[PDB]
Structure formats: structure tokens, C-alpha cells
Amino acid sequence: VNIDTLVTRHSAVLGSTGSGKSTTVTSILQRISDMSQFPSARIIVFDIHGEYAAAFKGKAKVYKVTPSNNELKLSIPYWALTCDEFLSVAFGGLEGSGRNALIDKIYELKLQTLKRQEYEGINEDSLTVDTPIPFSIHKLWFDLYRAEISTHYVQGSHSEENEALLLVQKGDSLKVVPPIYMPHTQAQGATKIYLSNRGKNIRKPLEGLASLLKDPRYEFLFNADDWSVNLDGKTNKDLDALLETWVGSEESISIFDLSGMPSSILDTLIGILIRILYDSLFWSRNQPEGGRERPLLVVLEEAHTYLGKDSRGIAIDGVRKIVKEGRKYGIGMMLVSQRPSEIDSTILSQCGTLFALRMNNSSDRNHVLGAVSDSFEGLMGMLPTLRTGEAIIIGESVRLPMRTIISPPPFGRRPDSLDPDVTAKWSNNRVQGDYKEVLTLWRQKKVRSQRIVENIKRLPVSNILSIGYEADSMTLEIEFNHGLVYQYYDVPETLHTELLAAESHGKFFNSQIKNNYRFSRI
Amino acid sequence: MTEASTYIGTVQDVNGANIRVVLDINTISSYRIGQIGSFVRIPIGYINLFGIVSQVGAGAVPDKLLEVEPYGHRWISVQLVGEEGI
């Protein structure tokens, strides 16, 4: 199979849910990005269900939402977005004068940041809202929310120096706490206090933004680790580090695990990532770090949910732009789906190569037949009766349409999402629970309890890969495969001392310790 | 002889000032083929009718053709602008 046409002319993998397309994609990716043959590979995967991280144990970087043992943390700074995408993410697309007010505030904050911190090739003349310059969002929220509720001490003038605060609540910028102001009352006897006369109609959007800031689900957006913005507009790191970590690491394959992200903004975030990657690899097409000197491949999972015929999302525009223009700047594409009838025909028709697996219904088969350019009546009638793992390669990347059996991946590299098992949990004997603890966790909006041991030192060795314990806290720590780490609390020393001297590592654990002691997965 | 240079297709529907043309060039796609802002020339005996393309793709296919065959889109929609005199 030709590989230059496979990347430059795009591809597509279509099949049924029972056809095991994940194994085929994993095998293809492993074969293309071999270290021995292609030392300078470059692949980006937009994993959605997080079922590809397991297949690549130590062969690829993984950027999840919540790191546990060794995976990194995905983080997209909000100041790297454009104005429209930022509005669609935070405020949901305001259309009134509030949009103008927010744009003006963004411009003012960016100008102040440029004044404070020197930047190369950027001045007051060549600054746009589109320019990715860091700026504080908490300061903006504080200013706009105080300029809408707080009441001036003296009527007629509503300057900031006339703060009519009852004394108590000064308020914090980094925190979401707002300041308190005395109520407006111009009656006789007492002092005349008037509310702010410049307040816009953005109270509800600002409350929503405050809720989003206080929500822990948006840490990757508003609380980037190395790209958090102080009130003066300064960050620990820059965007170059992010770009290097994304498409410049020593590992050939980088996987984005978007399983834990909210379902209402996934399309927008995919569009954001696509736009950032395309711009970064387009504006530097002469340097050795550009796409022309090192072509990049993008693998998109479950393309039928975003590339529909009438989809109004942002990712569809980026996908169309890549499909139309990557042949020149060296950016490939590879759509994977289990429902070809949902993908846009104008997009599916431009894919150079098709990997047609077994398809069950007739709509998908008809769509595939209509979206093909090289058909042999002998082979195309075999689609509903293809063996699992067998593909029919068709397109410009092969001399002839041939029916292949994709080479299976090496042992210990079978993709499998860590979906909780129904049988094990449902068959276990029910035990007592801590209603107070779960209620407190729900009120706090945190996933880490208070009784978690910090730095237990473990030792090497259903399977058990490591074992740790402490005599001071009497809490047992057992590490399983797939990166799972458990922490059983209030265990006597006798149990784990006997376990360490047992014939094997297990069995007895399931016999006595598995379902008697309260635990907490970390 | 055959269709000479600068040939696109034939008229297949008239609604007064909304012409629908079926493309004949299979895979030329490169003077580029009719774009959105491009002009086309329709000679009638002696005079040339100049027109402007307005819709390209599924938007120009007649309603019943889509219901019959929704996988083939080789139609363009031309709106007449003016004519060249003598």
C-alpha cells in the first residue's frame, strides 16, 4: 500500500461496531509510525472514548483530563482562542451591545498587557483581538461585575472612587467572591446613595461566567497549570512550550483523550484544536518545524457526530479546510466512523482511500458504493460477509482494489476502553456506604476525600503489580494493572504481612481483603 | 467536431431567469471551471447571453432528481444578467 498518497490524499475507515475497526486503526498506526523505518513520524489522534490509550502503553504520549500516574494533563489556555470562539464558549454567543463591550474590554486588557510585557514584532499599531496575547480573565470579570451592581456613594457621578460599601466584603479578583455595596437610597434623613449609571445588561452572562470559573470542570480552560494569568498579565510559560509538547515531543504519536470533557462544548474544542494546529503548521511552512518538511496526520474518531449534513458546529469548517488544502501544506486526515450515512457526502467523496470493513445495514453500503471511484462487481458484493479484521482497500493509494487481512498488533497492545464491568460489580455482595461522605463530596464538588494517604512507598512484585503499606496509618495500598491504584483503609498488620508471605500475589486478597474494607481509588 | 475549447454543459431547465446547467466536463477542475463568481456564455444563434453562476452543487439539482438520485451532483445554477447586442 502506498504511503505518500495515504497521507497527502487523506483516507477513511468505515465499518460496523462488531467489525473491530479499533484494532485495524491501531495496527495501521503502529505500522506507519515504526521507529526502525520511520524515525521522524508525526501523528495526532482525536480520541473521544479514550480507547486508544490502553493500546499504546509507552509508545505514545497521552493527554487526558485528570492525570493519575503518568499521563499528562490536557490544557488549552483561553487567551489562545479567537474572539468568536471565546464568546461561543464562555457567554454562549451574545449578540447585543454586550458583545461590543466585551470586545472593547479585551482590547484594553491586551493593550495594557503589551505595555507591561514586551513582545517581539507587536506594537499598538499591529495589535488585533485575534492576536494570542495573554490577559487576565478574573480582572475583566471583576471590573464588569462591579460596574453593574455596586452603587456610588454620591449621586450624579458613578466613579470607582465613590464606592458605597457597607462596613465589609472587599472582594477578591482571583477568587469569585464579589464585593458588597450599600443599597441605593436617596431619601431624606440619611445619605443619598445612587446605583451605578454605566451598568450594561450583562448581569446574567457575568453570573454564568462566574459559575463557569467556579466550576472545577473547566480547569483545563481557565486554570492552565503553566499558563495561568496573574492580575498584571504574566504567565509562567508561553505558547511555544505548548506547541512543542503537542507536535514536537520525542514521541511520534500524541493522543488527546477527550472522554472527561463536557458534552456541550466538545465540537467547539475540536474546532479550536484543528484551527490551532492548522495555523501553526501553515504560518511556518518554510522552517524545518513546519508541515512541509515534516508532514502531520490527524486521526478523528466518530466523525459522524460532527460532520453531519446540516451540522452548525465549528469543527466541520476546519475539517473541510484541511481536506481541501492539506495536499499543499502537508496536513493529512483520516476519518473513522461506524455510520457512513451520517458523514457529509461532499466530504466523504474527497477521501482518497477507503478501508471498507463489514457493514450490516443497506444505507451505509449504498452510501459507500455512491462515494467510491474504483469498483469491481466481484468484490463489492462481498461487503456484508467480511471476516472480522479483514478490509477491502480501495482508492488512489493502491494499484488494484484488493481484499486484505490486516496484520494483528503485537501482544499487549489491544485497544480496550476501561469501561467498568457489569458482572463484577453487580455480582459482589452489597456493603455499607458512607452517605455523609458522599454528600460532603457532592457539596464540595471535589473527587478526593480527606482520608487519602499522601506518599505511601510501594514495593514491586485481578493481577497485582505492586504492594504498599504503612504501620502508622494502617492503610493498605495495592496497585493493579492498567494503572489502577487502590487504597484500603484500617487494615491490621497481620493481614498484609501474611499476604506478603503468601504463595502468590492475589487469590487470598480476593478471599479476605477485597470486600471487607472501605477503599478509595486514586 | 467535438465540443471545442471553453465548453461546460447544456441547459436543462428554464424558469425565466434561473437556468440550470448539467456539467459535461468530467474531471477537469482546472481558466478554471465555473466558480461562484465566474461568468458563462450562452450563444443563441447570433447573440451571446451572458450569465453569472449562483449555486453549485446540491443547491442547483431539481427537487425531484434529489429524491430520485441523491448521490450525484453535477449541476450548476446560472442567473442571466444581460446580452451582447449587434
Coordinates of C-alpha atoms in Angstrom, one line a residue:
Chain A
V1 CA 0.0 0.0 0.0
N2 CA 1.4 3.4 -1.0
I3 CA 2.0 5.7 2.0
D4 CA 2.6 9.1 0.3
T5 CA -0.9 9.0 -1.2
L6 CA -2.4 7.6 2.0
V7 CA -1.3 10.8 3.8
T8 CA -1.5 13.5 1.2
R9 CA -4.8 12.4 -0.3
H10 CA -6.5 11.6 3.0
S11 CA -8.2 8.3 4.0
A12 CA -11.2 6.9 5.7
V13 CA -12.1 3.7 7.7
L14 CA -15.7 2.6 7.7
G15 CA -17.3 -0.5 9.3
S16 CA -19.7 -1.8 11.8
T17 CA -19.4 -1.8 15.6
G18 CA -18.7 -5.5 15.6
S19 CA -16.1 -5.4 12.9
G20 CA -13.3 -4.4 15.3
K21 CA -12.2 -1.2 13.5
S22 CA -10.2 -0.1 16.5
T23 CA -7.8 -3.0 16.1
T24 CA -7.3 -2.2 12.4
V25 CA -6.7 1.5 13.2
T26 CA -4.2 0.6 15.9
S27 CA -2.3 -1.8 13.6
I28 CA -2.2 0.7 10.8
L29 CA -0.9 3.5 13.2
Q30 CA 1.7 1.1 14.7
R31 CA 2.9 0.0 11.2
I32 CA 3.2 3.6 9.8
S33 CA 5.0 5.1 12.8
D34 CA 7.6 2.3 13.2
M35 CA 10.7 3.6 14.9
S36 CA 13.1 1.4 12.9
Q37 CA 11.7 2.5 9.5
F38 CA 10.2 6.0 10.1
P39 CA 12.2 7.7 12.9
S40 CA 10.5 11.1 12.2
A41 CA 6.8 10.1 12.3
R42 CA 4.1 12.6 13.3
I43 CA 0.6 11.6 14.2
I44 CA -2.2 13.2 16.2
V45 CA -5.2 11.3 17.4
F46 CA -8.5 12.9 18.5
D47 CA -9.6 10.1 20.8
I48 CA -13.1 10.6 22.1
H49 CA -13.9 7.5 24.2
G50 CA -10.3 7.0 25.3
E51 CA -10.0 3.5 24.0
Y52 CA -6.6 4.1 22.2
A53 CA -4.5 5.0 25.3
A54 CA -4.6 1.4 26.5
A55 CA -3.2 0.1 23.2
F56 CA -0.2 2.4 23.3
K57 CA 1.3 1.8 26.8
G58 CA 4.6 3.5 26.5
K59 CA 4.8 4.2 22.8
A60 CA 2.8 7.4 22.8
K61 CA 2.2 10.5 24.9
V62 CA -1.4 10.7 26.4
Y63 CA -3.0 14.0 27.3
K64 CA -6.0 13.2 29.5
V65 CA -8.2 15.4 31.6
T66 CA -7.4 14.0 35.1
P67 CA -3.9 12.5 35.3
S68 CA -3.4 9.6 37.8
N69 CA 0.0 8.0 37.5
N70 CA 2.0 9.1 34.4
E71 CA -0.3 10.7 31.8
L72 CA -0.1 14.4 31.3
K73 CA -2.9 17.0 31.7
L74 CA -4.6 18.5 28.6
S75 CA -4.8 22.2 29.0
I76 CA -5.8 24.8 26.4
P77 CA -5.3 28.4 27.6
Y78 CA -8.3 30.7 26.9
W79 CA -6.2 33.5 25.6
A80 CA -5.1 31.4 22.6
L81 CA -8.7 31.4 21.3
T82 CA -10.1 34.0 18.9
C83 CA -12.9 36.4 19.9
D84 CA -15.7 34.5 18.3
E85 CA -14.8 31.1 19.8
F86 CA -14.2 32.7 23.2
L87 CA -17.7 34.3 23.0
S88 CA -19.3 31.0 21.9
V89 CA -17.5 29.1 24.8
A90 CA -18.0 31.5 27.7
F91 CA -21.1 33.6 27.1
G92 CA -22.8 31.3 24.5
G93 CA -22.9 33.9 21.7
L94 CA -24.2 37.3 22.9
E95 CA -25.4 39.5 20.1
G96 CA -26.3 42.8 21.7
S97 CA -24.1 45.7 22.7
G98 CA -22.6 43.4 25.4
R99 CA -20.5 41.8 22.6
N100 CA -19.1 45.3 21.8
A101 CA -18.4 46.0 25.5
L102 CA -16.6 42.7 25.9
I103 CA -14.6 43.2 22.7
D104 CA -13.5 46.7 24.0
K105 CA -12.5 45.2 27.4
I106 CA -10.5 42.5 25.7
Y107 CA -8.7 45.1 23.5
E108 CA -8.0 47.3 26.6
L109 CA -6.6 44.4 28.6
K110 CA -4.4 43.2 25.7
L111 CA -3.1 46.8 25.2
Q112 CA -2.3 47.0 28.9
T113 CA -0.5 43.6 28.9
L114 CA 1.5 44.6 25.8
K115 CA 2.5 47.8 27.6
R116 CA 3.6 45.8 30.7
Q117 CA 5.3 42.9 29.0
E118 CA 7.5 43.4 25.9
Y119 CA 6.6 41.2 22.9
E120 CA 8.5 40.8 19.7
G121 CA 7.2 42.4 16.5
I122 CA 3.9 43.6 18.2
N123 CA 3.1 47.2 18.9
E124 CA 0.0 49.3 19.4
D125 CA -0.5 49.6 15.6
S126 CA -0.4 45.8 14.7
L127 CA -2.4 44.5 17.7
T128 CA -5.7 42.7 17.0
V129 CA -8.2 40.9 19.2
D130 CA -7.3 37.8 17.3
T131 CA -3.6 38.1 18.4
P132 CA -2.9 35.4 21.1
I133 CA -1.6 37.7 23.9
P134 CA -2.2 36.6 27.5
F135 CA -4.5 38.6 29.6
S136 CA -6.3 38.1 32.9
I137 CA -10.0 37.0 32.8
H138 CA -10.7 37.3 36.6
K139 CA -9.8 41.0 36.4
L140 CA -12.2 41.5 33.5
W141 CA -15.0 39.7 35.3
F142 CA -14.3 41.7 38.5
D143 CA -14.4 45.0 36.6
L144 CA -17.5 44.3 34.6
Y145 CA -19.4 42.8 37.5
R146 CA -18.6 45.7 39.8
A147 CA -19.5 48.2 37.1
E148 CA -23.1 46.8 37.1
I149 CA -24.2 46.3 40.7
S150 CA -22.1 48.4 43.1
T151 CA -23.7 51.8 44.0
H152 CA -21.9 55.1 44.0
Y153 CA -21.7 56.9 47.3
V154 CA -22.7 60.3 45.7
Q155 CA -25.4 60.6 43.1
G156 CA -24.7 62.1 39.7
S157 CA -21.2 60.7 39.4
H158 CA -20.6 56.9 39.5
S159 CA -16.8 56.8 39.6
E160 CA -14.9 53.9 41.2
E161 CA -13.7 56.2 44.0
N162 CA -17.3 56.7 45.2
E163 CA -17.6 53.0 46.4
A164 CA -20.6 52.9 48.8
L165 CA -19.5 49.7 50.6
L166 CA -21.3 48.8 53.8
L167 CA -19.0 48.1 56.7
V168 CA -17.4 44.5 55.0
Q169 CA -16.8 42.5 51.8
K170 CA -13.9 44.0 50.0
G171 CA -13.9 41.2 47.4
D172 CA -11.1 39.3 45.7
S173 CA -10.1 39.2 42.0
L174 CA -8.6 35.8 41.8
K175 CA -11.5 34.4 43.9
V176 CA -15.0 34.5 42.6
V177 CA -16.3 36.4 45.7
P178 CA -17.9 39.8 44.7
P179 CA -17.8 42.9 46.9
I180 CA -20.8 44.2 48.7
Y181 CA -22.2 47.7 48.3
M182 CA -24.7 49.7 50.3
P183 CA -28.2 49.8 48.9
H184 CA -29.3 52.9 46.9
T185 CA -31.5 55.3 48.9
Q186 CA -31.7 59.0 48.2
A187 CA -34.5 59.7 50.7
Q188 CA -34.2 62.4 53.4
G189 CA -32.7 61.8 56.7
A190 CA -29.9 59.5 55.6
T191 CA -27.2 60.0 52.9
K192 CA -28.3 59.8 49.3
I193 CA -26.7 56.8 47.5
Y194 CA -27.2 56.1 43.8
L195 CA -26.6 53.0 41.8
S196 CA -24.0 52.9 39.0
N197 CA -25.3 54.7 35.9
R198 CA -23.0 52.8 33.4
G199 CA -24.2 49.3 34.2
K200 CA -24.9 47.3 31.0
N201 CA -27.3 44.4 30.6
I202 CA -24.7 41.7 31.1
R203 CA -25.6 40.7 34.7
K204 CA -26.8 37.2 33.7
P205 CA -23.8 36.4 31.3
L206 CA -21.4 37.6 34.0
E207 CA -23.1 35.4 36.6
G208 CA -22.8 32.5 34.1
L209 CA -19.1 33.2 33.6
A210 CA -18.6 33.4 37.4
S211 CA -20.3 30.0 37.7
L212 CA -18.0 28.6 34.9
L213 CA -14.9 30.0 36.7
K214 CA -16.0 28.4 40.0
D215 CA -16.8 25.1 38.2
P216 CA -14.0 22.5 38.5
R217 CA -15.0 21.0 35.2
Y218 CA -13.2 23.9 33.4
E219 CA -9.8 23.7 35.0
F220 CA -8.2 22.8 31.6
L221 CA -9.6 26.1 30.2
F222 CA -9.5 28.7 33.0
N223 CA -6.8 27.3 35.2
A224 CA -4.0 26.2 32.9
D225 CA -1.0 24.9 35.0
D226 CA 1.9 26.6 33.3
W227 CA -0.3 29.2 31.5
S228 CA -2.3 30.8 34.3
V229 CA -2.5 34.6 34.1
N230 CA -1.9 36.8 37.1
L231 CA -3.7 40.2 37.5
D232 CA -0.8 42.0 35.9
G233 CA -0.9 39.7 32.8
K234 CA 2.0 37.4 33.2
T235 CA 2.3 33.6 32.7
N236 CA 4.8 31.1 33.8
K237 CA 5.2 29.7 30.3
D238 CA 4.4 30.6 26.7
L239 CA 2.5 29.0 23.8
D240 CA 5.8 27.7 22.3
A241 CA 6.1 25.2 25.1
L242 CA 2.5 24.0 24.4
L243 CA 3.2 23.6 20.7
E244 CA 6.4 21.7 21.4
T245 CA 4.6 19.4 23.8
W246 CA 1.9 18.8 21.2
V247 CA 3.7 18.3 17.9
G248 CA 7.4 18.4 18.9
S249 CA 7.9 15.8 21.6
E250 CA 10.3 12.9 21.2
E251 CA 7.3 10.5 20.8
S252 CA 5.8 10.0 17.4
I253 CA 2.2 9.6 18.4
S254 CA 0.3 12.1 20.6
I255 CA -3.2 11.1 21.8
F256 CA -5.9 13.5 23.1
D257 CA -8.3 11.8 25.5
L258 CA -11.5 13.8 25.4
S259 CA -13.6 11.4 27.4
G260 CA -13.9 13.6 30.5
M261 CA -14.8 16.8 28.8
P262 CA -18.3 18.3 28.8
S263 CA -20.6 17.2 26.0
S264 CA -21.9 20.6 25.1
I265 CA -18.5 22.1 24.0
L266 CA -16.7 19.1 22.5
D267 CA -17.4 20.3 18.9
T268 CA -16.1 23.8 19.7
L269 CA -13.0 22.4 21.3
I270 CA -12.3 20.1 18.4
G271 CA -12.6 23.1 16.1
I272 CA -10.3 25.1 18.3
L273 CA -7.6 22.4 18.2
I274 CA -7.9 21.9 14.5
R275 CA -7.6 25.6 13.9
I276 CA -4.6 26.0 16.2
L277 CA -2.8 23.1 14.5
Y278 CA -3.5 24.2 11.0
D279 CA -2.4 27.8 11.7
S280 CA 0.8 26.7 13.5
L281 CA 1.8 24.4 10.6
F282 CA 0.7 26.9 7.9
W283 CA 2.4 30.1 9.0
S284 CA 5.8 28.3 9.4
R285 CA 5.8 26.3 6.2
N286 CA 9.4 27.2 5.4
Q287 CA 11.1 26.3 8.7
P288 CA 12.1 22.7 9.4
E289 CA 9.5 22.5 12.1
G290 CA 6.7 23.1 9.5
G291 CA 4.4 20.6 7.9
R292 CA 6.2 20.8 4.5
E293 CA 9.4 19.4 6.0
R294 CA 7.6 17.0 8.3
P295 CA 4.0 16.1 7.3
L296 CA 1.5 15.6 10.1
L297 CA -1.5 13.3 10.2
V298 CA -4.8 13.9 12.1
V299 CA -7.0 10.9 13.1
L300 CA -10.6 11.8 14.0
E301 CA -12.8 9.3 15.8
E302 CA -16.6 9.1 15.5
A303 CA -16.7 11.6 12.6
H304 CA -20.5 11.1 12.1
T305 CA -21.4 13.1 15.2
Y306 CA -19.8 16.3 13.9
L307 CA -19.6 16.0 10.1
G308 CA -23.4 15.7 9.5
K309 CA -25.1 17.3 6.5
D310 CA -26.6 20.2 8.5
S311 CA -24.1 20.4 11.3
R312 CA -23.7 24.0 12.6
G313 CA -20.5 23.4 14.6
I314 CA -17.1 24.8 14.1
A315 CA -15.2 21.5 13.6
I316 CA -16.8 20.9 10.2
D317 CA -15.3 24.1 8.8
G318 CA -11.8 23.0 10.0
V319 CA -12.3 19.5 8.6
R320 CA -13.4 20.9 5.2
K321 CA -10.4 23.3 5.2
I322 CA -8.0 20.6 5.9
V323 CA -9.5 18.2 3.3
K324 CA -9.3 21.0 0.7
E325 CA -5.9 22.5 1.5
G326 CA -3.7 19.9 3.2
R327 CA -2.3 18.5 0.0
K328 CA -0.1 21.6 -0.4
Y329 CA 1.0 22.4 3.2
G330 CA 1.3 18.7 4.2
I331 CA -1.5 18.0 6.6
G332 CA -3.3 14.7 6.2
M333 CA -6.6 13.4 7.6
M334 CA -8.1 10.0 8.4
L335 CA -11.8 9.8 9.3
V336 CA -13.0 6.8 11.4
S337 CA -16.7 6.2 11.7
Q338 CA -19.3 3.4 12.2
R339 CA -22.1 5.2 10.4
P340 CA -21.1 6.3 6.9
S341 CA -24.6 7.5 6.1
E342 CA -24.3 10.4 8.5
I343 CA -21.0 11.8 7.1
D344 CA -21.4 14.6 4.6
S345 CA -21.3 13.3 1.0
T346 CA -19.2 16.3 -0.2
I347 CA -16.6 15.4 2.5
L348 CA -16.7 11.6 2.1
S349 CA -16.3 11.9 -1.7
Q350 CA -12.9 13.7 -1.4
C351 CA -11.2 10.9 0.7
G352 CA -8.6 9.3 -1.4
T353 CA -8.6 5.8 0.2
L354 CA -11.4 3.8 1.7
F355 CA -11.0 0.9 4.2
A356 CA -14.4 -0.7 3.9
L357 CA -14.9 -3.2 6.7
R358 CA -18.1 -5.3 7.2
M359 CA -21.3 -3.2 7.1
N360 CA -24.7 -4.6 8.2
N361 CA -27.5 -2.3 7.0
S362 CA -28.2 -1.1 3.5
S363 CA -27.9 2.7 3.9
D364 CA -24.2 2.5 4.8
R365 CA -23.4 0.1 1.9
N366 CA -25.3 2.3 -0.5
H367 CA -23.5 5.5 0.7
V368 CA -20.1 3.7 0.4
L369 CA -21.0 2.5 -3.1
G370 CA -22.0 6.0 -4.1
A371 CA -18.8 7.5 -2.6
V372 CA -16.3 5.3 -4.4
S373 CA -14.4 5.8 -7.7
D374 CA -13.0 2.3 -8.4
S375 CA -15.5 -0.6 -8.1
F376 CA -15.2 -4.2 -9.1
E377 CA -18.5 -6.1 -9.1
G378 CA -16.9 -9.2 -7.8
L379 CA -15.5 -7.7 -4.6
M380 CA -18.1 -5.0 -3.8
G381 CA -20.9 -7.7 -3.4
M382 CA -18.9 -9.2 -0.6
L383 CA -19.3 -6.3 1.9
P384 CA -21.9 -7.7 4.3
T385 CA -20.0 -11.0 4.7
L386 CA -16.4 -9.9 5.5
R387 CA -14.5 -11.6 8.3
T388 CA -13.6 -9.6 11.4
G389 CA -10.3 -7.8 10.9
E390 CA -10.5 -8.0 7.1
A391 CA -10.7 -4.9 5.0
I392 CA -11.2 -4.0 1.3
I393 CA -8.7 -1.3 0.4
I394 CA -9.9 1.0 -2.4
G395 CA -8.6 4.3 -3.7
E396 CA -5.7 6.1 -5.2
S397 CA -3.1 4.6 -2.8
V398 CA -3.3 1.1 -4.3
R399 CA -2.7 -0.3 -7.8
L400 CA -5.7 -2.6 -7.6
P401 CA -8.7 -2.8 -5.2
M402 CA -7.5 -5.8 -3.1
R403 CA -9.1 -7.7 -0.1
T404 CA -6.5 -7.8 2.7
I405 CA -6.2 -9.2 6.2
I406 CA -4.6 -6.5 8.4
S407 CA -1.7 -7.8 10.4
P408 CA -2.7 -8.1 14.0
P409 CA -0.9 -5.9 16.5
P410 CA 1.7 -7.3 18.9
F411 CA 0.7 -8.8 22.2
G412 CA -0.3 -6.5 25.0
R413 CA -1.3 -3.7 22.5
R414 CA -5.0 -4.5 22.0
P415 CA -7.1 -1.3 22.4
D416 CA -9.8 -1.6 25.1
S417 CA -11.6 1.2 27.0
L418 CA -11.6 0.8 30.8
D419 CA -15.4 0.6 31.0
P420 CA -16.5 -0.6 34.4
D421 CA -17.5 -4.3 34.3
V422 CA -21.2 -5.0 35.0
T423 CA -20.7 -8.6 36.1
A424 CA -18.0 -8.0 38.8
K425 CA -19.7 -5.0 40.4
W426 CA -23.2 -6.4 40.1
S427 CA -22.3 -9.9 41.5
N428 CA -20.4 -8.6 44.5
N429 CA -22.1 -8.7 47.9
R430 CA -23.5 -5.3 48.9
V431 CA -21.7 -3.5 51.8
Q432 CA -22.4 -0.4 53.9
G433 CA -21.8 3.0 52.5
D434 CA -20.9 6.5 53.7
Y435 CA -23.8 8.7 52.9
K436 CA -22.4 11.6 54.8
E437 CA -19.0 11.4 53.0
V438 CA -20.6 11.3 49.5
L439 CA -22.9 14.2 50.5
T440 CA -20.0 16.3 51.7
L441 CA -18.0 15.5 48.5
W442 CA -21.0 16.5 46.4
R443 CA -21.4 19.8 48.3
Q444 CA -17.7 20.5 47.9
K445 CA -17.5 19.4 44.3
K446 CA -14.2 17.5 44.7
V447 CA -13.2 13.9 43.9
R448 CA -10.5 13.5 46.6
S449 CA -11.6 12.5 50.1
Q450 CA -9.9 13.7 53.3
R451 CA -8.6 10.3 54.4
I452 CA -6.3 9.8 51.4
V453 CA -2.7 8.9 52.3
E454 CA -0.2 11.1 50.6
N455 CA 3.1 9.4 49.8
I456 CA 3.0 5.7 50.7
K457 CA 6.1 3.9 49.4
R458 CA 5.2 0.8 47.5
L459 CA 7.2 -2.4 46.6
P460 CA 7.5 -4.4 43.4
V461 CA 6.3 -8.0 43.0
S462 CA -7.1 -9.5 39.4
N463 CA -3.3 -9.4 38.9
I464 CA -1.2 -7.4 41.4
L465 CA 1.8 -5.4 40.1
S466 CA 2.8 -3.6 43.3
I467 CA 2.1 -3.5 47.1
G468 CA 2.4 -0.7 49.6
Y469 CA 1.5 -0.4 53.3
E470 CA 2.1 1.8 56.3
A471 CA 2.1 0.9 60.0
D472 CA 1.3 4.4 61.2
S473 CA -2.0 4.8 59.3
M474 CA -2.7 1.0 58.9
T475 CA -3.9 1.6 55.3
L476 CA -3.1 -0.9 52.6
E477 CA -2.2 0.1 49.0
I478 CA -2.4 -2.4 46.2
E479 CA -1.6 -1.5 42.6
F480 CA -3.2 -3.5 39.8
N481 CA -2.6 -3.4 36.1
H482 CA -3.8 -0.7 33.7
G483 CA -2.5 1.9 36.1
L484 CA -5.2 1.2 38.8
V485 CA -4.2 2.1 42.3
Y486 CA -6.5 1.3 45.3
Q487 CA -6.2 2.3 49.0
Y488 CA -7.9 0.1 51.6
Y489 CA -8.2 1.7 55.0
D490 CA -7.9 0.4 58.6
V491 CA -6.2 -2.9 57.9
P492 CA -4.3 -4.8 60.6
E493 CA -0.7 -5.5 60.0
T494 CA -1.3 -9.3 60.2
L495 CA -3.3 -9.4 57.0
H496 CA -0.8 -7.7 54.8
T497 CA 2.2 -9.4 56.5
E498 CA 0.5 -12.8 55.7
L499 CA -0.3 -11.7 52.2
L500 CA 3.4 -10.7 51.5
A501 CA 4.4 -14.2 52.7
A502 CA 1.7 -16.0 50.7
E503 CA 2.4 -18.3 47.8
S504 CA 1.3 -15.8 45.2
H505 CA 0.1 -12.1 44.8
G506 CA -3.7 -12.4 44.7
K507 CA -6.4 -15.0 45.5
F508 CA -6.1 -14.5 49.2
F509 CA -6.6 -10.8 48.6
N510 CA -9.9 -11.6 46.9
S511 CA -10.6 -14.2 49.6
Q512 CA -10.3 -11.9 52.6
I513 CA -9.4 -8.2 51.8
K514 CA -11.2 -7.5 48.6
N515 CA -14.7 -6.9 50.0
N516 CA -14.4 -6.2 53.7
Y517 CA -12.5 -2.9 54.0
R518 CA -13.6 0.5 52.6
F519 CA -11.4 1.7 49.8
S520 CA -10.9 4.8 47.6
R521 CA -9.5 4.7 44.1
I522 CA -6.8 7.2 43.3
Chain B
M1 CA -16.3 18.3 -34.5
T2 CA -16.5 17.6 -30.7
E3 CA -17.1 20.1 -28.1
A4 CA -14.5 22.8 -28.7
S5 CA -12.5 24.7 -26.1
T6 CA -14.4 26.6 -23.4
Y7 CA -17.3 24.1 -23.1
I8 CA -19.1 23.3 -19.9
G9 CA -22.5 21.8 -20.4
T10 CA -26.1 22.1 -21.7
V11 CA -29.2 23.9 -20.5
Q12 CA -31.7 21.5 -18.9
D13 CA -34.2 23.8 -17.1
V14 CA -35.6 27.3 -17.6
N15 CA -37.7 29.2 -15.1
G16 CA -37.4 32.6 -16.9
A17 CA -34.3 33.9 -15.3
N18 CA -33.0 30.8 -13.4
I19 CA -31.1 28.5 -15.7
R20 CA -29.9 25.1 -14.5
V21 CA -27.0 23.5 -16.4
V22 CA -25.7 20.0 -16.3
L23 CA -21.9 19.8 -16.3
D24 CA -20.2 17.8 -19.1
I25 CA -16.6 18.2 -18.2
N26 CA -15.9 15.0 -16.2
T27 CA -12.8 15.8 -14.0
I28 CA -11.2 19.0 -15.5
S29 CA -11.5 21.0 -12.3
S30 CA -8.7 23.3 -13.6
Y31 CA -9.1 29.5 -16.9
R32 CA -10.6 27.5 -14.0
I33 CA -14.0 25.8 -14.3
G34 CA -17.1 27.8 -13.4
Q35 CA -16.8 29.1 -9.8
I36 CA -19.4 31.1 -7.8
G37 CA -18.3 34.5 -9.1
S38 CA -17.5 33.3 -12.7
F39 CA -19.3 34.2 -15.8
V40 CA -20.7 31.9 -18.5
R41 CA -21.7 32.5 -22.2
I42 CA -24.7 31.0 -23.8
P43 CA -24.9 31.7 -27.6
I44 CA -28.3 31.7 -29.2
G45 CA -27.9 31.6 -33.0
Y46 CA -26.3 35.1 -33.3
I47 CA -26.2 36.8 -29.9
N48 CA -24.5 35.7 -26.7
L49 CA -26.4 35.5 -23.4
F50 CA -24.0 36.3 -20.6
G51 CA -24.9 35.0 -17.1
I52 CA -23.4 34.6 -13.6
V53 CA -23.2 31.4 -11.6
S54 CA -25.2 31.5 -8.4
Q55 CA -25.4 27.9 -7.0
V56 CA -23.0 25.0 -7.4
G57 CA -23.7 21.5 -6.0
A58 CA -26.8 20.1 -4.4
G59 CA -28.4 23.5 -4.4
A60 CA -28.8 23.5 -8.2
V61 CA -30.2 20.0 -8.6
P62 CA -34.0 19.9 -9.2
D63 CA -36.1 18.8 -6.3
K64 CA -37.3 15.5 -7.8
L65 CA -33.8 14.5 -9.0
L66 CA -32.6 14.6 -5.5
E67 CA -35.5 12.4 -4.3
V68 CA -34.6 10.0 -7.2
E69 CA -30.8 10.1 -7.1
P70 CA -29.4 12.0 -4.1
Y71 CA -25.7 10.9 -4.7
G72 CA -24.9 12.6 -8.0
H73 CA -24.4 16.4 -8.1
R74 CA -23.2 17.7 -11.5
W75 CA -25.4 20.7 -11.7
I76 CA -24.9 24.5 -11.6
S77 CA -27.5 27.3 -11.3
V78 CA -27.0 30.2 -13.7
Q79 CA -28.8 33.6 -13.4
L80 CA -28.9 35.6 -16.6
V81 CA -27.5 39.1 -16.4
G82 CA -27.5 40.6 -19.9
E83 CA -27.0 40.1 -23.6
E84 CA -24.5 41.4 -26.2
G85 CA -26.1 43.4 -29.0
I86 CA -25.1 43.6 -32.6

